[PDB]
Structure formats: structure tokens, C-alpha cells
Amino acid sequence: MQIYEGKLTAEGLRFGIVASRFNHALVDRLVEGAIDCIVRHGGREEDITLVRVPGSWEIPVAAGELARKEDIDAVIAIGVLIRGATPHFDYIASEVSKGLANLSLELRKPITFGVITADTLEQAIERAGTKHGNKGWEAALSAIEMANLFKSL
Amino acid sequence: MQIYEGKLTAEGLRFGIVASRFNHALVDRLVEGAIDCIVRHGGREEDITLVRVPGSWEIPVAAGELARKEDIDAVIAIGVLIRGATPHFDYIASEVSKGLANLSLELRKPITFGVITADTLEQAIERAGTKHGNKGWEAALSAIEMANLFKSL
Amino acid sequence: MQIYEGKLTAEGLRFGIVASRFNHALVDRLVEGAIDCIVRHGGREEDITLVRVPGSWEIPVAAGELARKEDIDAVIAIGVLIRGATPHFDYIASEVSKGLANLSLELRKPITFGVITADTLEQAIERAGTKHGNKGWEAALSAIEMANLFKSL
Amino acid sequence: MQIYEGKLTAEGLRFGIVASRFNHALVDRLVEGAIDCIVRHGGREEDITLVRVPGSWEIPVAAGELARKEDIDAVIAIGVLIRGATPHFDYIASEVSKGLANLSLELRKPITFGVITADTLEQAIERAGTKHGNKGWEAALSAIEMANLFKSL
Amino acid sequence: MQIYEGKLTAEGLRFGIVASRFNHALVDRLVEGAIDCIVRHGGREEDITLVRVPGSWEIPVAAGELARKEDIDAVIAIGVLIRGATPHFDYIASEVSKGLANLSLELRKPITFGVITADTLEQAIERAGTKHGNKGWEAALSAIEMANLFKSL
Amino acid sequence: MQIYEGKLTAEGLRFGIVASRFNHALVDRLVEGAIDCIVRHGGREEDITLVRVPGSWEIPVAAGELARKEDIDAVIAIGVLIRGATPHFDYIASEVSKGLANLSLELRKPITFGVITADTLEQAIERAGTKHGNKGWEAALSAIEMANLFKSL
Amino acid sequence: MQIYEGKLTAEGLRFGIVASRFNHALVDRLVEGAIDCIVRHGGREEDITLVRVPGSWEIPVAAGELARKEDIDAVIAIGVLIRGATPHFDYIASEVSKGLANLSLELRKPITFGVITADTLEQAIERAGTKHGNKGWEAALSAIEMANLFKSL
């Protein structure tokens, strides 16, 4: 049986990060987490491209631009959505997830999902570098593995 | 690390606004907000194109026409949906959000989401220039940032 | 500021109507409403093409055929869905709305949504020419405005 | 006014049926119903192609193959989904409906929806040839009408 | 009618920020927000003076020193007060607000109020770069507008 | 960006303390705390001036006298108010806080607020050298920082 | 400021694992997790020594033997304790944790704690490669970081 898997070393890999600015007190923790993951797994900070966008709605169109670059091996999408009083959250979360998933398939390049979709502020804090870990770190680790997998093929 | 971001100056930028007429007592406040944002950030009113459509359902097909214009840097979609008695709201909100998101990716051009999707009339009033701000102003600010980002690249 | 809008005169405009037969006691009121709107706004009955399909599920594939005709300026989709005992309603309503929205964007031609999606029979009667108006009339008015807008461009 | 409609005679029409095997005690009643409808409306049993697939998930990819055949006028999709204990039902029902709807538009050929999506076993029995009729018969009747409509054009 | 208003460009403007150290995990987010606002609206980071004081009580006397500088166009006061168990919060909040308001009138120079006065820790987190925005960003935007207004006169 | 801050060394600094005698069993702990803070941060006990007044009402007029001395760098106001049965507490607390805040601005000299305003005796004990620290120590630390800041300017 | 940290590459590192046999259906998942972590971070499976002991009580005395080996850089202790009906769990959990902590300090070598101490079977399953991750993987990652840190010094 032929087995393909990605290792977790980031030596030589080039990453794009697209990070939204809304809820920046939490998003900044996710970006720190993603960068720390890449560097301590052997990636170069110089090989990271970071794109900032205003809100999660804008992540896919920016991710589309990064994922089309030949010198980017994987894109990490980072943002924080917290449900408010209206149905707005539902529509944004659906379109951000759908757009990133569709781009990955269209461009045949890994795009990992480091977007917190929380019902409450507490849940978002828990997942941005406190008790339930750091979703930016997790999305970076997924991107390292997938970039390595795609090299193997 | 390469960082790309958009500044908030609108000098030289050209914008399209697509605004639905339904719930016009509120939509007109969102359009006022978007225009005020553009002008006080240094954009020219002469560089704004405004398209009026009957309802939110028609926003995407009109946005498609504006976003295909070479002299438009970003499109701001503006409308107000308020849940009624039937499931109708759900289907309209889903298709408007999906269509705008898909167009942005297909055309590789920022389209920002200034459509209120409210459960109640009060929630819509709150987001159309009262206690929870002005979603038209917010969508214009997002469009300025994204137009600048896309120039940087 | 450049402003584009559609007027509400239907002189010279050519329309397609796709109407489902299920719930025909109500759909026939919506079709009457759409035709009345077109004619009293100055359209010619001779410039209307009406396509009948069995149920709402079949509206998009028929609308696709009409919207591809060069001599059709706008398509009005008409039907009535009323929730039954199973989840069936949800799947049909989602696909009909998604298909019409997608066709409008693909073909760059207005397709208006005159499909009632009701939780109860009473709600459907209310929207088919009684206390909450006539959704066929409303969809025709939207189609007149959009056809005029698209001429202006 | 130009009116296009399909009659309910099946003389000369060729049909594909794609039927899932899961819940076969009920699906077999739907297939019987579809075939009976075609034959007693004047279709030839020899002009029916039946494709069996394991579950509803597999209906769209098989329907894609049949609907691409030049000698097939319409495809009838037949299956039975009954909600279980997990969210699984929701994901399968959504993808089966979305896939069939998308295929019909892409291939410009009628594909009718004879898939029961039931919350309970009783609801499925009711719609597979007992008190609420036979959804296979209904989907075949819809396919006859649409095949005739598409000839008219 | 003579209309005076401030635009939102910060080119050439010089700002003072007075920021308290108490609740620094949140105040540091407000200061980041204020600086980001100034810079992305075209201000120079070199034209910002930041004064740190121990607690909100000390903000006015420090703001008095900055607002008396001829090369400062506007002062942004930043701090976070969260109600504790005693009446202490009431007395501090009253004196900080009164002192800043009085200084602005005495010196005829804009001083904007970026001090969170929260009943709970959650409310303060919400307003320091999470779900209810960033009060430091808001106070900086107000200071840009007022500095521009005062130039116009 | 120009940053001004005060360090926490008290070498060379001269302080005034104004301490009320009412609730002296607790005020004496606050005065001990303030003096300990100054001395262990490097201040000389010989450089402290202590003024005793009968009650918190009299603190501002005495603080006015100390803060006008050229050889005083900062004044620490110390007292304990505990709510009694009447509205009296409210009026005293308001005037003491208002007077100290106003004096600091008028004289452009730091005056720090080491006055406990407690609803209960227990709350006052907690803040006078037990479980919630020592407000006299805290006010002295604030005065050291502000005296150093004002030197820097 | 001198900063010491460990990277997450395991190239060249040699590890000991001590794994208890009680609750082996879960412990075997933790051991799989630890080994997978080491290998995909670049460690050699040949550089792992695995010691099996009967129960968690016996982990420290075996860990003592491994941690005294000059060719072992870090020890990973793996086991699963689930509270039963008596106080037994408390005494075992206390002694296993105390013994491992004491050994690490005595031998000045990292020993990481991959022992689940669960109140219920469900909690243990959650932490042995299901919804709350894999504590063996986590303990191995900690051991890689600490082995690298200790090299740096």
C-alpha cells in the first residue's frame, strides 16, 4: 500500500497568512501563534507573507491573491467571528468558509482554516491562546503538514 | 516577513455602490454613510457610481456589472433585510451573501458587504446610523482599505 | 456622482415568466398579477413568454432556457412552496433560490424571485393577491425596473 | 402571449432512472411507481435505463453520466433518506439536492427529484406508495412533462 | 449657510496620547488602536507623543501638560476603569471625565475621551479590540476630525 | 514616537502627605504604607512632610497649602470614608475627590488619591493593609511615578 | 535580554517512553501518539526506548532507570488513571505525579507528564486521541522542546 503523509518540519516552506483586523485583540494572538509555529518548526520568518484585511468577509478575496503566487506553498486564513444580536454572523461565517474551501479546490493548494467562529466572547478567548489552545498555531501546523504532503504528492 | 496592508486614504480611488430600494428609509441612511466615508477620507464624489436596484435579491447581478468595469476599484453592496413572517428572509439573505462572495472571487475585486440582515426593525434602525453605527459607513471603510491593499498587491 | 436607476415604464420590454403548476390555485393568481403589472405599465402582452413547469424544482432549468434567449430582457420566476410535514420543503426552497440566483449571475440577466416560501397555507394565500399583496406583481415590477436599469447599463 | 407547456404523453420519450439501494424496501416501491407512470402514459419500458447506486450520496455522480447521454431526454433521481441520530442526514440531503440541481442547469436537461427526505420511517412509508402517494410516480410525471416542454422549447 | 467640518486625513497632524497603566492588558490594546488609526489615516508615528501615567486619576494632570504644548493639535486620553466592590469607581470616573472636559474648554484644544468606564471585565474586553470595537481607535478618529475642524476654525 | 514615563525610584523626591484623623485605626495603616513605599524606593524620610487634618472634608484645603510649596514634588492625600446611615458620605466623598482633582489641575502638580471610599467597615479594612493591599502604599507609588514623569516633562 | 527556548525539531534527539499497561486500550493510543510526534518532527524511531510497566504506580521507578541513562535526552511518562469507587485513585495519582516531578529535579533531566488523570471513562477517551487531542502526542512535543532547550542550556 502506497502511503503519503506530511512531516512537520517547515524548513524551506513559504507561507501566506491572511488575517482580518476585526476583533484584533484576539486575532493578533492567532497571528503570533501561527508565526511561532512556523519558526519553531524550522521555517524562516522571511518566508512568511502577511496580508491584513478589514474583516473576515474580505479574507477569501485576499487569500485568492496569495494562493495564486507560485512562491507560496500554503495559505493560513486567520480571523475571529463572534455571534452578535442579528443573523449577520451566520451569513459571514458561511461565506468565509465556503470561499476558502472553494479556492483551495480551484487552485489545488492547501488553505487552512484558522478562523474562530464563536457563539460568545469567552469561547473566542479560550481558542486564541488560552485554555483551548491557539487556532492560529493549529492552522499553521496543518499548513506545514499539507505543504509537505503536496510535495510528496 | 513581507507585510501587505491597506491605508485608509481614498484619494484617487473609484467606487461603485449598489443600493437596494426596499426599506429605503433605512437604506438611504446607509448610502449617505458610505458617501460621507469616501469623501471625508479624500475620495471624490465624482468618482462614485451609484446603482439603485429594487430589492436585495437584485444586488448581486447589478454588482456583477459594476465590478466588471475597469475604472471601478471596489464595490460596496448596500441593503436592508428584515425578517418577516415566512422563511423568505432566509432564502434572500443566503443568496445575496453567496452571490456577492462568489463575484468577488470570480472577478478578483473587493466587494464589501453593507447589507443589514436583521431579525427585527429595531435591530435594523440600530445599524443604520444610530446606536450600533452605520453599516454603509463600515462597508465603505472596508472598501477603501481593500482597494488600497489590492494596489499594494 | 454617476447614478444609474431603472424607471417603471415597460414600453418595448420583453419578459419571460416561468410558473410552476403545483399549488396552482395560488400560482395562477401570481401569474395574473405579473401579467397585469406588465400590461398596465405599458408592456405588450404579445411580448410576454410564459413557460409552465410541474413544480418549483423545475423552475431553474426552464428559466435557464428563457434567460438564454436574446429577445428576453428579464425573467420572472413564479411558484408557491408551502412547508409540509417533512424536511422536503427546505431542500426544494434552497435549490430553487440558489439556481435562479446563480443563473442570473452566469447569464448577466435579471431573474426576479416571485416564489412564495410559506410555512403555512394562510401565509401563502396572504401573498397571492390578498392582504400582503401579490408576489407575482412585485416580481414583475422588479423585472421592469431591472430591465430598464440594464439598458441604462 | 407565447405559452410553452408540456403534455403528459410519454410516447417516444427515453428516460434514465438513478435509484439508490439504501432503504430498498421503500426505494423499490418508488422505482415501480416511476416505471408504471412511464408505461401507462405511453412510454416504452425498452426506452428506460435504470442505474442502481449504493446510497443517495452516489445518485448525482451517476445521474451526471446518464444525463450526458444524447439518447436520454430526462433523468429521474430516486432514493429514500430517513433522519437518524446524527447530523449525517442533513449533509447527505443537502449534497444530493444541490448536486442534482446543479447538474440539471449545467447540462440543460431536466432531472427530477424523487428523493424522499423524511424525519421518520412513517413519513417515508407514507410517500412510497401509501397514504401520501408515490414520489417515484410523481417524479416520473414531472420528467414526462419537462421532456415534452423541452421539445417544444 | 457656512458649514465647518473636519476631514479624516491625519497628514501633518501631531497628537498627544495619555495612557494609564492600570488594567494594562486592555489599555495596551487601546493604545495600539489609537496609533494604528493615526498612522493608517496618514499621520506620522514620529508626530505622536505618548505619556504613561499610573492610573486614570492621573490622566487629567498629564493631559494638561500635553495640551499646553504648542506643537500638539489634539490629545487622546486612554484608560480602563472597571467597577470594583466599593464606590471608588464612581469618584474616579467622575473626576477623570470632569477634568478632561474642563481642560479642553480652558485650553481651547480638543481632548478626546478614550477611557472605558465598565461595570464588568467582560464589558471592558468587548470595547478594547473585540466585539464592540476599540475605544482607542475611536478616540483617535475623533481627535483627527477635531484637529482638522479646528484648523478650518 | 516620543515616550514619556516615570520610573519608580524616589531618590531626591520630596513628598507631602495629607492624612485625615477620622477612622484613624485605618488611616494610620495607610500612612505607614505610604511612608514605607517612599523609603524603600529610595526616598528620604526627612524629605516627607506630613499634615494631619480632622476629617476627609479638610484634606483639600490642606493639600492646597502643601501643593503650593516649591519644595514639594507631589502630594499624597490619605483618608478613610465609610458610608453611614445618611447621605452624608456621598457629599463628603464627592467634594474631597472634586477638590483634589481641581487642585492638581490648577497647580499643575500631581496629587494622588489614597482615600478609601467604602460602603462597609470590612471593605475599608481590606484596603488598609489586608487582603486588598494598602491604598496608602498605592497612592505613594503613583506619586513617585508622577513626580518622576513631571521631571522628564 | 538573554532568551533561551527550544525548537520543535527532533533530529538527533533520543527519547525514553515509560508506558503503563493498565487501561491499555487507551494507553496504546497515547504511545502511538508520542511515537508519531517524535517521528514526524524528525526523530528516529530507532532512537526511542519504550519501557512497559504494569500500572501507573510503577512508572516513576522505571522512569528513574531511563532518566539515568546518558544516551536519553528526555523521558515521556504515559499512563491512564480513571477514578474508581474508592480513594485509591487519589493516592496513586499523587504519588505518580510527585515521583516524576522529584526525579526530574534530582536528575536535572526533563520528564514530561503524559498521564491522564480522569474522573470518568469518557474524559479519558476524549484525551487519548479523540475530541480533546492526545496527551501522549502533547507530552512528546513537550519533551522535544525541553530536550532542545536543555541543549541550548
Side-chain angles (χ1 to χ4, degrees), chain D residues 27-100:
Chain D
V27 173
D28 290 347
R29 311 296 72 79
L30 299 179
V31 171
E32 287 164 350
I35 293 166
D36 179 58
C37 181
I38 292 164
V39 170
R40 288 203 291 128
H41 281 88
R44 299 198 300 131
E45 73 87 73
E46 295 101 305
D47 289 336
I48 302 171
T49 299
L50 173 64
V51 173
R52 302 187 184 287
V53 296
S56 293
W57 176 262
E58 290 74 36
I59 292 172
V61 70
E65 293 308 303
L66 278 193
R68 283 183 169 83
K69 292 176 164 58
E70 164 280 321
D71 54 354
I72 292 285
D73 299 312
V75 176
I76 303 157
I78 298 192
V80 171
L81 287 166
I82 302 164
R83 186 183 302 282
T86 73
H88 172 77
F89 169 94
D90 300 318
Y91 297 109
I92 304 302
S94 293
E95 292 322 301
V96 176
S97 56
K98 175 254 273 166
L100 293 170

Side-chain angles (χ1 to χ4, degrees), chain E residues 63-80:
Chain E
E65 293 308 303
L66 278 193
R68 283 183 169 83
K69 292 176 164 58
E70 164 280 321
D71 54 354
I72 292 285
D73 299 312
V75 176
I76 303 157
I78 298 192
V80 171

Side-chain angles (χ1 to χ4, degrees), chain E residues 36-112:
Chain E
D36 179 58
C37 181
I38 292 164
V39 170
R40 288 203 291 128
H41 281 88
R44 299 198 300 131
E45 73 87 73
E46 295 101 305
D47 289 336
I48 302 171
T49 299
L50 173 64
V51 173
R52 302 187 184 287
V53 296
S56 293
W57 176 262
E58 290 74 36
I59 292 172
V61 70
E65 293 308 303
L66 278 193
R68 283 183 169 83
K69 292 176 164 58
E70 164 280 321
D71 54 354
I72 292 285
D73 299 312
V75 176
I76 303 157
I78 298 192
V80 171
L81 287 166
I82 302 164
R83 186 183 302 282
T86 73
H88 172 77
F89 169 94
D90 300 318
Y91 297 109
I92 304 302
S94 293
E95 292 322 301
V96 176
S97 56
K98 175 254 273 166
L100 293 170
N102 290 346
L103 281 170
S104 186
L105 294 188
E106 164 180 42
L107 298 176
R108 300 174 61 184
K109 183 172 296 188
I111 305 181
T112 62

